[PDB]
Design a protein around this ligand. Sequence first.
Ligand SMILES: *[C@@H]1O[C@H](CO)[C@@H](O[C@@H]2O[C@H](CO)[C@@H](O)[C@H](O)[C@H]2NC(C)=O)[C@H](O)[C@H]1NC(C)=O
Ligand SMILES: *[C@@H]1O[C@H](CO)[C@@H](O[C@@H]2O[C@H](CO)[C@@H](O)[C@H](O)[C@H]2NC(C)=O)[C@H](O)[C@H]1NC(C)=O
Ligand SMILES: *[C@@H]1O[C@H](CO)[C@@H](O[C@@H]2O[C@H](CO)[C@@H](O)[C@H](O)[C@H]2NC(C)=O)[C@H](O)[C@H]1NC(C)=O
Ligand SMILES: *[C@@H]1O[C@H](CO)[C@@H](O[C@@H]2O[C@H](CO)[C@@H](O)[C@H](O)[C@H]2NC(C)=O)[C@H](O)[C@H]1NC(C)=O
Ligand SMILES: *[C@@H]1O[C@H](CO)[C@@H](O[C@@H]2O[C@H](CO)[C@@H](O)[C@H](O)[C@H]2NC(C)=O)[C@H](O)[C@H]1NC(C)=O
Ligand SMILES: *[C@@H]1O[C@H](CO)[C@@H](O[C@@H]2O[C@H](CO)[C@@H](O)[C@H](O)[C@H]2NC(C)=O)[C@H](O)[C@H]1NC(C)=O
Ligand SMILES: *[C@@H]1O[C@H](CO)[C@@H](O[C@@H]2O[C@H](CO)[C@@H](O)[C@H](O)[C@H]2NC(C)=O)[C@H](O)[C@H]1NC(C)=O
Lengths: 49, 99, 268, 49, 49
Amino acid sequence: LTGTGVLTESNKKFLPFQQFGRDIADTTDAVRDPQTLEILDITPCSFGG
Amino acid sequence: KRVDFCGKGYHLMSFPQSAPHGVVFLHVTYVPAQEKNFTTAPAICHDGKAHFPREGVFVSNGTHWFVTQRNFYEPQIITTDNTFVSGNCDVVIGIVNNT
Amino acid sequence: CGDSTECSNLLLQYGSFCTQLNRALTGIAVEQDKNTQEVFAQVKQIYKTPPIKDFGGFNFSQILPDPSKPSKRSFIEDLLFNKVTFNGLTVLPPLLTDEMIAQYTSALLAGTITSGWTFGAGAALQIPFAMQMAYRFNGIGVTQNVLYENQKLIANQFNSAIGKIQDSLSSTASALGKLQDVVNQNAQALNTLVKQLSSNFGAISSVLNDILSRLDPPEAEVQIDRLITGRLQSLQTYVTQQLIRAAEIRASANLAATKMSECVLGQS
Amino acid sequence: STASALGKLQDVVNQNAQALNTLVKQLSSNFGAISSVLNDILSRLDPPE
Amino acid sequence: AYTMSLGVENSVAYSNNSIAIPTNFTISVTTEILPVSMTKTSVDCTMYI
Ligand SMILES: *[C@@H]1O[C@H](CO)[C@@H](O[C@@H]2O[C@H](CO)[C@@H](O)[C@H](O)[C@H]2NC(C)=O)[C@H](O)[C@H]1NC(C)=O
Ligand SMILES: *[C@@H]1O[C@H](CO)[C@@H](O[C@@H]2O[C@H](CO)[C@@H](O)[C@H](O)[C@H]2NC(C)=O)[C@H](O)[C@H]1NC(C)=O
Ligand SMILES: *[C@@H]1O[C@H](CO)[C@@H](O[C@@H]2O[C@H](CO)[C@@H](O)[C@H](O)[C@H]2NC(C)=O)[C@H](O)[C@H]1NC(C)=O
Ligand SMILES: *[C@@H]1O[C@H](CO)[C@@H](O[C@@H]2O[C@H](CO)[C@@H](O)[C@H](O)[C@H]2NC(C)=O)[C@H](O)[C@H]1NC(C)=O
Ligand SMILES: *[C@@H]1O[C@H](CO)[C@@H](O[C@@H]2O[C@H](CO)[C@@H](O)[C@H](O)[C@H]2NC(C)=O)[C@H](O)[C@H]1NC(C)=O
Ligand SMILES: *[C@@H]1O[C@H](CO)[C@@H](O[C@@H]2O[C@H](CO)[C@@H](O)[C@H](O)[C@H]2NC(C)=O)[C@H](O)[C@H]1NC(C)=O
Ligand SMILES: *[C@@H]1O[C@H](CO)[C@@H](O[C@@H]2O[C@H](CO)[C@@H](O)[C@H](O)[C@H]2NC(C)=O)[C@H](O)[C@H]1NC(C)=O
């Protein structure tokens, strides 16, 4: 799941068999770490004019 | 007559001028100024009847009542030829006594 | 490109497609700001209504602002606001905030209640509301004679109509069709633009990293060319649709400005 | 005396001139090819490519 | 940098038996500029492409 972003802590709950989530238009929005089985979050580090 | 179509104010006339790829209008407009205060009443009770103004508005300067045009202060005394009658005055809210 | 080097290098030799691409969007945004300014900024001062209100019997409490609410918006505005609802794309805030728009509308409405139409030409002139209605009957053929003899009945009809429209807006939905349609169209356009980033366009994959990671530049460049052509086509189509829609919205805004100028600031 | 009074006509003229200029400048783009001029590529190749 | 002011705030001295009538006038001449045309352009294919 290669990609760049900033990883924070979240609160949503995965069912015991998902690996990662997404919200709409097929963009990854949360990942479960394969070590501690905790739900992370993904936010693009800011940019602008 | 359509408001604010060409000119801020009351339109009078206009002049066109050319420009390399367009037109330039010079809108002449009338704008009132130097306002003042008065006291108004929507009708006048005389002999029970209720006179209304044909065109204009009633005003007063403290002692005397006048009828004026609505866009330029010009007071004229009240006479039976610029007012018209309609019924008697007990249903109108704002009547005032005068002659 | 999605923050890649060789993609940027390949896109560089395509000339300047993107300078005017950004120019068009900037012009569109400036156009929206100008639209809002020309629609609402019809007045020079900011008028206010007196605390004591005796408008011959007419009742404006449903449209006049109330200081209790934090937003200072009236009841009908509350009903309307309640009823209706990152991949290099950004959204910018409007220059005017909703509070200032509400202030503009409140100033307009207080002026037309207390001054009449005279505040659109020069300085606002006070005029008691009842004997202002007698100036609007006179402009449709009916003499003023009528109004001063049916004042209470007219006031009751107006209040009942206000209550009826209040309830019709409150309960029945799907009345604010056009704004909802505009919002849905914009959202659909953005969503379908976003979803195009998952298309092969005749290439081997929709992800740059994999195609550059298991190949070599000699033909990875060709695959990137296919991706670039597809994405450029999609972006150009999106920009053209945006331009057409902006033209339609500008026509509607001009119509709204004319309506505000001719029916609010005067009798048509 | 005052300048910048004739804004709209000047903007129209500038828009047209800029459109023409950017159309002209597109002639110097490789478009992914080996050159932006036809004579040399015809003179140093064969018809196939 | 500051917060925008929409204009000077005044309260019209509303009452129910008071009017204000102008006593003088002014005449104002204001300009308005509208484009009506743009330069006609023609393009030849073979010469350009
Ligand atoms: C793999 O990850 C770690 C590696 O040791 C282990 O899980 C943790 O193990 C440490 C001590 O070895 C404990 O203190 C933690 O409480 C463990 N956490 C979890 C979430 O297990 C274990 O070997 C493996 N864990 C998993 C989940 O596969
Ligand atoms: C007409 O009279 C009203 C009330 O007398 C004037 O409104 C007030 O004028 C005084 C001037 O001494 C101000 O201090 C008040 O602030 C005004 N009232 C409000 C609510 O602002 C009004 O100015 C008079 N009209 C003219 C043209 O002089
Ligand atoms: C209100 O206006 C009336 C009419 O102009 C004034 O009445 C006359 O005023 C003049 C002086 O301005 C006197 O010479 C006359 O004797 C007055 N009466 C008549 C019948 O002409 C009145 O003075 C004005 N009052 C105020 C307070 O301005
Ligand atoms: C204009 O407003 C004033 C004050 O709001 C009204 O004066 C009141 O008149 C009623 C009877 O008409 C009296 O019982 C009150 O005592 C008056 N109030 C004061 C403060 O004296 C006046 O009637 C209104 N006029 C119109 C035409 O609406
Ligand atoms: C205006 O004039 C009328 C008529 O002169 C007044 O009405 C009379 O008032 C007196 C005293 O209040 C009563 O005794 C009469 O019954 C009333 N009617 C008639 C036909 O005389 C009225 O009060 C005056 N003032 C106003 C504000 O209308
Ligand atoms: C204008 O209309 C509003 C809406 O009906 C009136 O507010 C109502 O007032 C009564 C009695 O004061 C209350 O029982 C209602 O609950 C109020 N309605 C709402 C929605 O709160 C208001 O009184 C009317 N204006 C006047 C001068 O009576
Ligand atoms: C209405 O306003 C005009 C100016 O817009 C006044 O005309 C001026 O009057 C003063 C004194 O009489 C002269 O010194 C000026 O030269 C006049 N101006 C012009 C352009 O001629 C006029 O007096 C005002 N009317 C009233 C009744 O006060």
